Amino acid sequence: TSRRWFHPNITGVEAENLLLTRGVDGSFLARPSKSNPGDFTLSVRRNGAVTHIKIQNTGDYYDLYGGEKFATLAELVQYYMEHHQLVIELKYPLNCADPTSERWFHGHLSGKEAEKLLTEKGKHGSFLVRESQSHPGDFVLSVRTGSNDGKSKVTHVMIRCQELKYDVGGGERFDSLTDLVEHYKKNPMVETLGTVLQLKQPLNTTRINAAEIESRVRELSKQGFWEEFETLQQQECKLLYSRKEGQRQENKNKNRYKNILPFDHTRVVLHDSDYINANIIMPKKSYIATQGCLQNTVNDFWRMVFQENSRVIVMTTKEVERGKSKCVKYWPDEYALKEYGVMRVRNVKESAAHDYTLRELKLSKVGQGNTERTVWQYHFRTWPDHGVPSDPGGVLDFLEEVHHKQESIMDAGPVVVHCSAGIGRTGTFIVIDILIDIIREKGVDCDIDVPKTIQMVRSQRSGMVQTEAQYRFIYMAVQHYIETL
Ligand SMILES: Nc1nc(N2CCC3(CC2)Cc2ncccc2[C@H]3N)cnc1Sc1ccnc(N)c1Cl
C-alpha cells in the first residue's frame, strides 16, 4: 500500500492549512511533533476544523492519546481506517508530495557523486533521483542498465519542475516525483535504439563495509540519521501482514497490548491452546521475539521454550518500571521448584553482574524426568526508563556472553528475547546481535546494511526497533564492537 499520509517536514500550522485548503471533513495526515521531538501528531479535520492528537513513543510502542497502543503508525492508520472508534473518523489520507523519505531520493547530491555510487554500488535497473545543480528546482533521474568492458552504462534524464508539476520533457505532468517515478517504473521510457530504462530498484547507498562504520556514523551525525530512519519508516507500509490468530476472541486476553499482535506467517504455534504473542526471527542463530508474560500466559511461555528447544532467554526489562508491570515473574526464586501447568522449572542458581542477573533454570515436562534441559535466563537490568543507554559497552558485553552461552550448547533452539510489548528493546537487542554475528564470522571486511536488516526483522514481527534513538544506538553498538577487535 502507501504511507503518503505521513508528512516528515511539516509544522502544525502548515498541516492545518493543508487540511483546511486541500482536504475535507474526515481527511487526516500524521507528522513529527515540533513541541515533543521523538513524538508524532495525528492531524484530523472534523466540522471544518482540525484536531491534533498526540502519539508518544518512548521506545516500546506508539501510544495514541484517547486511543490504543500500536507497533507502527501504518498499523495504527490501518486499524482506525478499517473501523476496527477513535467519535473522530480517519476517512481520507491527505497525501505528501515531499520525496524526502523515498529510498530512491538523494536530495542535494552531485552528478559526480551520483555516477561514482551507481558505478560502484549500482547493478542493472538501479536508479536514484537528485536535485539538479544546473537548473534550480529541477531534478535528475539516473538509471544503470546492463566496470571495464562497457557492457553497462548510466543514462541521465532531466525532470522539469514547471508550475508545481514534474515531467521528463514530454508526456504526462505529475503532482510529485513519486507519481513520476511510479508511472515510469510501470511504463518504462525506451531509448531511440531500444534500451529500456527499467527502474528496477533504488540504488543501495546504506550497505557499507564494516570498517567504514565510524565514517558512515560521522556522515549521519551532521542530519543524515533522521533522513535514513524516516526512509526506513516509510517502507513499513509493505509489512501489513495478517495477525488474525491474535485477534480471535479466545486469544485477546493473551496479548499485553490488544493491537500489538504476531504475524500469522511467523507466529510460534504451540502443539500438544495453540497461541502465544511470539514470532520466530530468522536472520546462524535464530530468535523468538515475544512480550513480557501475563499471569495467564506463564504456562504458554514455558510450553513455547520447551517445544522450541530454547536454551537461552534474554529479558530486557525489570518486572516493574516507573511503577508499571512490564513482565510477570515466570521463574522460581533461587533454589525453588515450581510447576507451570505441565512444565516444571528449578532455579538452580543465580549469578549477579552489574548490568544483568543470570538464572540457571532446569526445565522438564511433569511425568517425564528424561525431558530435562538447562535454560539460561540473562536478565538485563540497567536499561534506562527513558531512551537508550549513553554507552553500548554493557549491552555488547551482555550479548557477547549470551552468544558464547548459546554457541556452547549443541542443537540449542532459538534464543528467546522479550521486554514489554517485545518490539522496541527486543528488536534493538536482536538487530545488534545479528549485525555483530556477521562481523564475528565474516570479519571486519564484510558488508552490513542496518536498515536492510531491520526491514528483514520487521517482516517477521510488527515494529521491531521502535525509535530513531534505538536506530542510532544500533549504529553506535556496531561501531563500538568494530573498534574493539
Ligand atoms: N533507510 C533507507 N535509507 C536509504 N537511503 C538513505 C536516506 C535517503 C535515501 C537513501 C538519502 C537521502 N539524501 C538526501 C535526502 C533524503 C534522503 C533519503 N531518501 C534508502 N533506503 C532505506 S530503507 C532500506 C534500505 C535497504 N534495504 C531495505 N530493504 C530497505 Cl527497506
From Swiss-Prot:
Annotated GO MF terms: cadherin binding; cell adhesion molecule binding; insulin receptor binding; molecular adaptor activity; non-membrane spanning protein tyrosine phosphatase activity; peptide hormone receptor binding; phosphoprotein phosphatase activity; phosphotyrosine residue binding
Effect annotated for changing L240R: In NS1; increases MAPK signaling; increased protein tyrosine phosphatase activity
Catalytic reactions of this protein: O-phospho-L-tyrosyl-[protein] + H2O = L-tyrosyl-[protein] + phosphate
Domain SH2: 5-94, 104-203
Effect after changing T371M: In NS1; uncertain significance
Effect of P451S: In NS1; increased phosphatase activity
Effect of D60V: In JMML; also in myelodysplastic syndrome
Outcome when changing Y257C: In NS1 and LPRD1; does not affect subcellular location; decreases protein tyrosine phosphatase activity against CDC73
Effect on the protein of changing G59V: In myelodysplastic syndrome
Main location: cytoplasm
Keywords recorded for this protein, A-Z: Acetylation, Cytoplasm, Deafness, Disease variant, Hydrolase, Nucleus, Phosphoprotein, Protein phosphatase, Repeat, SH2 domain
Tissues in which the protein is found: Widely expressed, with highest levels in heart, brain, and skeletal muscle.
Residues that bear N-acetylthreonine: T1
SUPFAM superfamilies found in the cross-reference section: (Phosphotyrosine protein) phosphatases II (SSF52799), SH2 domain (SSF55550)
Residues annotated to bind substrate: D385, C419, S420, A421, G422, I423, G424, R425, Q466
Post-translational modification: Phosphorylated upon activation of the receptor-type kinase FLT3. Phosphorylated upon activation of the receptor-type kinase PDGFRA. Phosphorylated by activated PDGFRB.
One of the record's GO cellular component terms: cytosol
InterPro entries cross-referenced by the UniProt entry: Prot-tyrosine_phosphatase-like, PTP_cat, SH2, SH2_dom_sf, Tyr_Pase_AS, Tyr_Pase_cat, Tyr_Pase_dom, Tyr_Pase_non-rcpt_typ-6/11
Its EC number(s): 3.1.3.48
Domain (Tyrosine-protein phosphatase): residue spans on this chain: 225-477
Residues bearing the modification Phosphotyrosine: Y61, Y65
Mutation effect (L239H): In NS1; increases MAPK signaling; increased protein tyrosine phosphatase activity
UniProt remark on domains: The SH2 domains repress phosphatase activity. Binding of these domains to phosphotyrosine-containing proteins relieves this auto-inhibition, possibly by inducing a conformational change in the enzyme.
Protein family per UniProt: Belongs to the protein-tyrosine phosphatase family. Non-receptor class 2 subfamily.
Function field: Acts downstream of various receptor and cytoplasmic protein tyrosine kinases to participate in the signal transduction from the cell surface to the nucleus. Positively regulates MAPK signal transduction pathway. Dephosphorylates GAB1, ARHGAP35 and EGFR. Dephosphorylates ROCK2 at 'Tyr-722' resulting in stimulation of its RhoA binding activity. Dephosphorylates CDC73. Dephosphorylates SOX9 on tyrosine residues, leading to inactivate SOX9 and promote ossification. Dephosphorylates tyrosine-phosphorylated NEDD9/CAS-L.
Protein name per its UniProtKB record: Tyrosine-protein phosphatase non-receptor type 11
Organism for this UniProt entry: Homo sapiens (Human)
Gene name of this polypeptide: PTPN11
